[PDB]
Design an enzyme around this catalytic site. Structure first.
Site, PDB file in Angstrom:
ATOM      1  N   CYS A   1       0.837  -1.203   0.000  1.00 23.72           N
ATOM      2  CA  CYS A   1       0.000   0.000   0.000  1.00 23.72           C
ATOM      3  C   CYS A   1       0.868   1.247   0.000  1.00 23.72           C
ATOM      4  O   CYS A   1       1.637   1.476   0.938  1.00 23.72           O
ATOM      5  CB  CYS A   1      -0.965   0.053   1.191  1.00 23.72           C
ATOM      6  SG  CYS A   1      -1.967   1.594   1.240  1.00 23.72           S
TER       7      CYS A   1
ATOM      8  N   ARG B   1       0.012   4.769   2.758  1.00 20.16           N
ATOM      9  CA  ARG B   1       0.041   4.583   4.205  1.00 20.16           C
ATOM     10  C   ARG B   1       0.447   5.829   4.995  1.00 20.16           C
ATOM     11  O   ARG B   1       0.377   5.796   6.230  1.00 20.16           O
ATOM     12  CB  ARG B   1       0.963   3.409   4.565  1.00 20.16           C
ATOM     13  CG  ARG B   1       0.370   2.008   4.271  1.00 20.16           C
ATOM     14  CD  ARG B   1       1.375   0.889   4.630  1.00 20.16           C
ATOM     15  NE  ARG B   1       2.308   0.595   3.544  1.00 20.16           N
ATOM     16  CZ  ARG B   1       3.510   0.040   3.707  1.00 20.16           C
ATOM     17  NH1 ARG B   1       3.925  -0.291   4.925  1.00 20.16           N
ATOM     18  NH2 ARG B   1       4.299  -0.183   2.656  1.00 20.16           N
TER      19      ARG B   1
ATOM     20  N   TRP C   1      -9.036   6.425  -1.375  1.00 17.36           N
ATOM     21  CA  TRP C   1      -9.242   7.094  -2.648  1.00 17.36           C
ATOM     22  C   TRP C   1      -8.205   6.587  -3.638  1.00 17.36           C
ATOM     23  O   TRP C   1      -7.201   5.975  -3.264  1.00 17.36           O
ATOM     24  CB  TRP C   1      -9.198   8.618  -2.497  1.00 17.36           C
ATOM     25  CG  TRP C   1      -8.003   9.121  -1.800  1.00 17.36           C
ATOM     26  CD1 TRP C   1      -6.762   9.298  -2.331  1.00 17.36           C
ATOM     27  CD2 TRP C   1      -7.920   9.536  -0.432  1.00 17.36           C
ATOM     28  NE1 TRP C   1      -5.902   9.800  -1.382  1.00 17.36           N
ATOM     29  CE2 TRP C   1      -6.592   9.954  -0.203  1.00 17.36           C
ATOM     30  CE3 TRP C   1      -8.836   9.591   0.622  1.00 17.36           C
ATOM     31  CZ2 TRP C   1      -6.159  10.416   1.032  1.00 17.36           C
ATOM     32  CZ3 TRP C   1      -8.404  10.048   1.858  1.00 17.36           C
ATOM     33  CH2 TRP C   1      -7.082  10.457   2.056  1.00 17.36           C
TER      34      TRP C   1
ATOM     35  N   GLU D   1      -3.999   3.864 -11.183  1.00 22.02           N
ATOM     36  CA  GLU D   1      -4.772   2.625 -11.095  1.00 22.02           C
ATOM     37  C   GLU D   1      -5.917   2.639 -12.092  1.00 22.02           C
ATOM     38  O   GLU D   1      -6.239   1.605 -12.690  1.00 22.02           O
ATOM     39  CB  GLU D   1      -5.344   2.395  -9.690  1.00 22.02           C
ATOM     40  CG  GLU D   1      -4.436   2.653  -8.505  1.00 22.02           C
ATOM     41  CD  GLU D   1      -5.194   2.405  -7.184  1.00 22.02           C
ATOM     42  OE1 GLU D   1      -5.781   1.310  -7.035  1.00 22.02           O
ATOM     43  OE2 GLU D   1      -5.235   3.310  -6.319  1.00 22.02           O
TER      44      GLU D   1
HETATM   45  C1  HEM Z   1      -6.352   6.831   1.451  1.00 16.34           C
HETATM   46  C2  HEM Z   1      -5.696   6.616   0.313  1.00 16.34           C
HETATM   47  C3  HEM Z   1      -5.146   5.238  -0.158  1.00 16.34           C
HETATM   48  C4  HEM Z   1      -4.413   5.108  -1.274  1.00 16.34           C
HETATM   49  C5  HEM Z   1      -4.022   6.252  -2.223  1.00 16.34           C
HETATM   50  C6  HEM Z   1      -4.055   3.723  -1.430  1.00 16.34           C
HETATM   51  C7  HEM Z   1      -3.315   3.191  -2.452  1.00 16.34           C
HETATM   52  C8  HEM Z   1      -3.082   1.851  -2.703  1.00 16.34           C
HETATM   53  C9  HEM Z   1      -2.648   1.277  -3.962  1.00 16.34           C
HETATM   54  C10 HEM Z   1      -2.396   2.084  -5.261  1.00 16.34           C
HETATM   55  C11 HEM Z   1      -2.515  -0.051  -3.791  1.00 16.34           C
HETATM   56  C12 HEM Z   1      -2.101  -1.074  -4.872  1.00 16.34           C
HETATM   57  C13 HEM Z   1      -3.405  -1.766  -5.257  1.00 16.34           C
HETATM   58  C14 HEM Z   1      -3.277  -2.639  -6.474  1.00 16.34           C
HETATM   59  O1  HEM Z   1      -3.041  -2.094  -7.573  1.00 16.34           O
HETATM   60  O2  HEM Z   1      -3.434  -3.879  -6.354  1.00 16.34           O
HETATM   61  C15 HEM Z   1      -2.862  -0.370  -2.415  1.00 16.34           C
HETATM   62  C16 HEM Z   1      -2.848  -1.617  -1.798  1.00 16.34           C
HETATM   63  C17 HEM Z   1      -3.385  -1.894  -0.541  1.00 16.34           C
HETATM   64  N1  HEM Z   1      -3.926  -0.971   0.336  1.00 16.34           N
HETATM   65 FE1  HEM Z   1      -3.908   1.099   0.139  1.00 16.34          FE
HETATM   66  N2  HEM Z   1      -4.594   3.020  -0.363  1.00 16.34           N
HETATM   67  C18 HEM Z   1      -5.271   3.909   0.442  1.00 16.34           C
HETATM   68  C19 HEM Z   1      -5.953   3.541   1.593  1.00 16.34           C
HETATM   69  C20 HEM Z   1      -5.971   2.299   2.179  1.00 16.34           C
HETATM   70  C21 HEM Z   1      -6.743   1.948   3.354  1.00 16.34           C
HETATM   71  C22 HEM Z   1      -7.709   2.949   4.041  1.00 16.34           C
HETATM   72  C23 HEM Z   1      -6.486   0.651   3.629  1.00 16.34           C
HETATM   73  C24 HEM Z   1      -7.027  -0.242   4.770  1.00 16.34           C
HETATM   74  C25 HEM Z   1      -7.568   0.277   5.884  1.00 16.34           C
HETATM   75  C26 HEM Z   1      -5.514   0.171   2.644  1.00 16.34           C
HETATM   76  C27 HEM Z   1      -4.961  -1.092   2.568  1.00 16.34           C
HETATM   77  C28 HEM Z   1      -4.358  -1.643   1.462  1.00 16.34           C
HETATM   78  C29 HEM Z   1      -4.060  -3.047   1.284  1.00 16.34           C
HETATM   79  C30 HEM Z   1      -4.393  -4.152   2.321  1.00 16.34           C
HETATM   80  C31 HEM Z   1      -3.494  -3.195   0.082  1.00 16.34           C
HETATM   81  C32 HEM Z   1      -2.996  -4.520  -0.530  1.00 16.34           C
HETATM   82  C33 HEM Z   1      -1.685  -4.688   0.224  1.00 16.34           C
HETATM   83  C34 HEM Z   1      -1.026  -6.035   0.105  1.00 16.34           C
HETATM   84  O3  HEM Z   1      -1.559  -6.957  -0.587  1.00 16.34           O
HETATM   85  O4  HEM Z   1       0.061  -6.128   0.740  1.00 16.34           O
HETATM   86  N3  HEM Z   1      -5.221   1.201   1.792  1.00 16.34           N
HETATM   87  N4  HEM Z   1      -3.185   0.825  -1.792  1.00 16.34           N
HETATM   88  N1  LIG Z   2      -6.544   3.009  -3.757  1.00 15.78           N
HETATM   89  C1  LIG Z   2      -7.034   1.760  -3.712  1.00 15.78           C
HETATM   90  N2  LIG Z   2      -6.801   0.900  -4.695  1.00 15.78           N
HETATM   91  C2  LIG Z   2      -6.896  -0.461  -4.608  1.00 15.78           C
HETATM   92  C3  LIG Z   2      -7.655  -1.133  -5.572  1.00 15.78           C
HETATM   93  C4  LIG Z   2      -7.772  -2.511  -5.568  1.00 15.78           C
HETATM   94  C5  LIG Z   2      -7.107  -3.180  -4.561  1.00 15.78           C
HETATM   95  C6  LIG Z   2      -6.368  -2.562  -3.617  1.00 15.78           C
HETATM   96  C7  LIG Z   2      -5.771  -3.576  -2.662  1.00 15.78           C
HETATM   97  C8  LIG Z   2      -6.311  -4.939  -3.149  1.00 15.78           C
HETATM   98  N3  LIG Z   2      -7.047  -4.540  -4.343  1.00 15.78           N
HETATM   99  C9  LIG Z   2      -7.584  -5.515  -5.265  1.00 15.78           C
HETATM  100  C10 LIG Z   2      -7.813  -6.824  -4.529  1.00 15.78           C
HETATM  101  C11 LIG Z   2      -8.134  -7.892  -5.573  1.00 15.78           C
HETATM  102  N4  LIG Z   2      -7.021  -8.022  -6.537  1.00 15.78           N
HETATM  103  C12 LIG Z   2      -6.811  -6.760  -7.267  1.00 15.78           C
HETATM  104  C13 LIG Z   2      -6.439  -5.683  -6.257  1.00 15.78           C
HETATM  105  C14 LIG Z   2      -6.233  -1.186  -3.608  1.00 15.78           C
HETATM  106  C15 LIG Z   2      -7.866   1.334  -2.558  1.00 15.78           C
HETATM  107  C16 LIG Z   2      -8.853   0.385  -2.324  1.00 15.78           C
HETATM  108  C17 LIG Z   2      -9.307   0.449  -1.012  1.00 15.78           C
HETATM  109  C18 LIG Z   2      -8.708   1.389  -0.172  1.00 15.78           C
HETATM  110  S1  LIG Z   2      -7.541   2.229  -1.137  1.00 15.78           S
HETATM  111 CL   LIG Z   3      -9.428  -0.739  -8.990  1.00 18.05          CL
END
Ligand code: HEM
Ligand SMILES: N=C(Nc1ccc2c(ccn2C2CCNCC2)c1)c1cccs1
Ligand SMILES: [Cl-]
Ligand code: HEM
Ligand SMILES: N=C(Nc1ccc2c(ccn2C2CCNCC2)c1)c1cccs1
Ligand SMILES: C[C@H](O)[C@H](O)[C@H]1CNc2nc(N)[nH]c(=O)c2N1
Ligand SMILES: C[C@H](O)[C@H](O)[C@H]1CNc2nc(N)[nH]c(=O)c2N1
Ligand SMILES: [Cl-]
Ligand SMILES: [Gd]
Ligand SMILES: [Gd]
Ligand SMILES: [Zn+2]
Lengths: 404, 403
Positions: free
Chosen positions: B107, B110, B279, B284
């Site tokens: 993520c 963070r 957001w 993405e």
């Molecule tokens: C507030 C703005 C946030 C932004 C800009 C953001 C951005 C991102 C992005 C771009 C990804 C990659 C997703 C993908 O393409 O698969 C990601 C992954 C992830 N995000 Fe964030 N996110 C935000 C908030 C959050 C919140 C609020 C949570 C949980 C409370 C969260 C938890 C996660 C998790 C669990 C993943 C997958 C991580 C993994 O598999 O190790 N995110 N995030």
């Molecule tokens: N900004 C975001 N983007 C994003 C979009 C898809 C995402 C994640 C993390 C897991 N996923 C899916 C899970 C299934 N496999 C494709 C990715 C984050 C966020 C989503 C929620 C809070 S922030």
């Molecule tokens: Cl998406």
């Protein structure tokens, strides 16, 4: 047996070659370190084991092992190390090892080409002046008036007696980096150390941003000696843009021949601290990394100003628009000069083909995803969507400590 | 021997001591790295996990070794002795969800981990009440375009009862209708969930941007089909600031990315239904959802409209078209007054996060291949940051699809 998916197609593959992985990498079940550039830190029995493994590969690779030359070479080597403490590669085993070490290089995206490699046997080299001769012939052969041809020149292997041959420069062609009153750099910031060594060993500094450094070549025990490369030997490309006519006035240049000179070649337990190799450029190496890295020439904002982009806000994507135009300029300028270059799209599509061939040939292919994916438009290339397994096979190229 | 970590833009070296605390094993060994794989994957184990989590909680509020700390540990020991499990306090549940986000190595958002609205839905008792909680989540988090990060936590997994599950991978997704020929109208990523919605009584559409209904599963009960009130689903039609024909492509995306199918694990308790949202980072939508060959795959169409030379790679038409698609996405969201962050701002803030975490915890798990945005990678500062990937708890986790 790692399972490996391509997410663009859905196709599945198993990497059985990884089972045969040798020297351990940096990662553990606790933590992955695959993003680190230099992992870890940089009885003649071990020689015999490494030597034996390399011969078996060789006689397998020439289709038939078993008895014949195989069992005879085996104890010619075994007896040579008993007599010598080391041993000598045949010319052909040397060819094979160089080609395999390239084929085994996980961060190399250009490996579709691994079978077409010119090996130059320089093991009969004695003087640093002879080093310079071998180098200048390599440079002539590899450059070929812009029709670039892969090559490696192998200098004498490390002897347990005394000496080591070393090329001190990180590449054969490098632009100087002069530190100034500010503490900033004119020229290439990656070369401030080597430019200082060339200075303090006699070289007279230069004026500007693209001064080709001299070579600091080190023969065994005797200290390094400066050598200037004949300018009609170092082929360079002035950079122009097909439609932005002011681009040429920025005075940007790059050289045609990427030739790495400071990595160690390892073949069946033998170590060649001097084995320069050269291929040709993928355009994103020049346009994105060398000219646009914040810690390299860092020209991105200069180009963006000239394009009248809104540099006041990140969300105009002016960094991206300028970067694409610099890469366009590199591709255009190299084509105009008829110097071999490949874009990141064509290069990554060829590496995909290489993975397919290597799956049938050896059952896998060590690949380092962070280095294979280009530094711009990553997910627009097919390797972005290709899962990859990274592991170390032998023969190999490795990084070594610098001789200072 | 802690990992030495270099920033190559600045020349900086740190050491990731935190990784020594990695509480679960990854897929890499000394023989081979598998960092690029997308899915790498009783009584006394639970208690040791509960104790570590309680210890974390009492560090966060600076009361380690205190009486309240000692007492909470004994309380948890007692409960899992009697019942085999325990219940989180509300304060611990908030702290745990924030910690799981802080720990998520992939993520890049963070920097915000401490600003998280935690909705406690652990008394939820039916699919209908699950749907009510979710609409209140979507409502709160959308906030008419001024997006607020939130998570709703449904009841934990417990012995003798099924889980709550949300079958949809996100709270808002576009339908993907498989055609006879093997093509897809709509989102190919969602073909399987679209086929499950139809066969649970949903009348499909034919559009490219049909918002799927929710399939909500309460314990020990087939999933139930719910349609979101269209007033709840903020969308943004995509226009280009200077390419006026772009609007005529008819492209849209939704405001709120809300992942609904991960498992949240806190102190050994598992919450299979805990959707979270924040957001979008614009790459993405622009690069992945619109330009992936296996997604909407619009890049060649945009390039041909741009009159680019799509016949040779060396013209860089793919890169020029992708940039403008991202320009459009950023422009359309700013126009529609919907929160969005570009990949330059996002990665710059992530670098600030890394510096904060190095001081606070001595490290930060980070998956390089996911932190680097999928275009313009080395133009961002995270490209030049070496990173260590490891698994801490509390954590968000992938879990098998319920069907
Ligand atoms: C507030 C703005 C946030 C932004 C800009 C953001 C951005 C991102 C992005 C771009 C990804 C990659 C997703 C993908 O393409 O698969 C990601 C992954 C992830 N995000 Fe964030 N996110 C935000 C908030 C959050 C919140 C609020 C949570 C949980 C409370 C969260 C938890 C996660 C998790 C669990 C993943 C997958 C991580 C993994 O598999 O190790 N995110 N995030
Ligand atoms: N900004 C975001 N983007 C994003 C979009 C898809 C995402 C994640 C993390 C897991 N996923 C899916 C899970 C299934 N496999 C494709 C990715 C984050 C966020 C989503 C929620 C809070 S922030
Ligand atoms: Cl998406
Ligand atoms: C002929 C066309 C070639 C192309 C287009 C190409 C491309 C590349 C690129 C882009 C890298 C990334 C390294 C960086 O940017 O820091 C690389 C790495 C590398 N290349 Fe190639 N290369 C070519 C030929 C060769 C040849 C001829 C050799 C050796 C005989 C070679 C051996 C290597 C090695 C050893 C590395 C570092 C590998 C590692 O650290 O795992 N390459 N190559
Ligand atoms: N096309 C090429 N590009 C390239 C550029 C720099 C390279 C490498 C492999 C190592 N280096 C440097 C060595 C110091 N560490 C950073 C990378 C490949 C080639 C160079 C030589 C044959 S092909
Ligand atoms: C930290 C990160 O691993 C480092 O910047 C790497 C990433 N990928 C790279 N890829 C290539 N081709 N060349 C590089 O120098 C790097 N640097
Ligand atoms: C094979 C590869 O790991 C896969 O396509 C990954 C690469 N990095 C990614 N990074 C992010 N942020 N999101 C992704 O979906 C992916 N996909
Ligand atoms: Cl280079
Ligand atoms: Gd301007
Ligand atoms: Gd226009
Ligand atoms: Zn790894």
């Amino acid at each position: 047996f790692p399972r490996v998916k391509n997410w663009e197609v859905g196709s599945i593959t198993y990497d059985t070659l990884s089972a045969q992985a040798q020297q351990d990498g940096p990662c553990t079940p606790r933590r992955c370190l695959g993003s680190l550039v230099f992992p870890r830190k940089l009885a003649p029995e071990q020689l015999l084991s490494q030597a034996r493994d390399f011969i078996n590969q060789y006689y397998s690779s020439i289709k038939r092992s078993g008895s014949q030359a195989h069992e005879q070479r085996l104890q010619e080597v075994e007896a040579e190390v008993a007599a010598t403490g080391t041993y000598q590669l045949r010319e052909s085993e040397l060819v094979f090892g160089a080609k395999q070490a390239w084929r085994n290089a996980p961060r190399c995206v250009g490996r579709i080409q691994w079978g077409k490699l010119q090996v130059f046997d320089a093991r009969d080299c004695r003087s640093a002046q002879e080093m310079f001769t071998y180098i200048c012939n390599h440079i002539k052969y590899a450059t070929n008036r812009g029709n670039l041809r892969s090559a490696i020149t192998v200098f004498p292997q490390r002897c347990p007696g005394r000496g080591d041959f070393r090329i001190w420069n990180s590449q054969l062609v490098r632009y100087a980096g002069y530190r100034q009153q500010d503490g900033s750099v004119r020229g290439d910031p990656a070369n401030v150390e080597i430019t200082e060594l060339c200075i303090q060993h006699g070289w007279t500094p230069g004026n500007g941003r693209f001064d080709v450094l001299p070579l600091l070549l080190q023969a065994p025990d005797e200290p390094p000696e400066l050598f200037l490369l004949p300018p009609e030997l170092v082929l360079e490309v002035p950079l122009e843009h097909p439609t932005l006519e002011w681009f040429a006035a920025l005075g940007l240049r790059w050289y045609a021949l990427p030739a790495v000179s400071n990595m160690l070649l390892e073949i069946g337990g033998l170590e060649f601290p001097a084995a320069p190799f050269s291929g040709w450029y993928m355009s994103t190496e020049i346009g994105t990394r060398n000219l646009c890295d914040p810690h390299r020439y860092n020209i991105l904002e200069d180009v963006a100003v000239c394009m009248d982009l809104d540099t006041r806000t990140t969300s105009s994507l002016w960094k991206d628009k300028a970067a694409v135009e610099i890469n366009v300029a590199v591709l255009h300028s190299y084509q105009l000069a008829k110097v071999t270059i490949v874009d990141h799209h064509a290069a990554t599509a060829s590496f995909m083909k290489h993975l397919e061939n290597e799956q049938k040939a050896r059952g896998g292919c060590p690949a380092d995803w962070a280095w294979i994916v280009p530094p711009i438009s990553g997910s627009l290339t097919p390797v972005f969507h290709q899962e990859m397994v990274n592991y170390f096979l032998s023969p190999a190229f490795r990084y070594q400590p610098d001789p200072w």
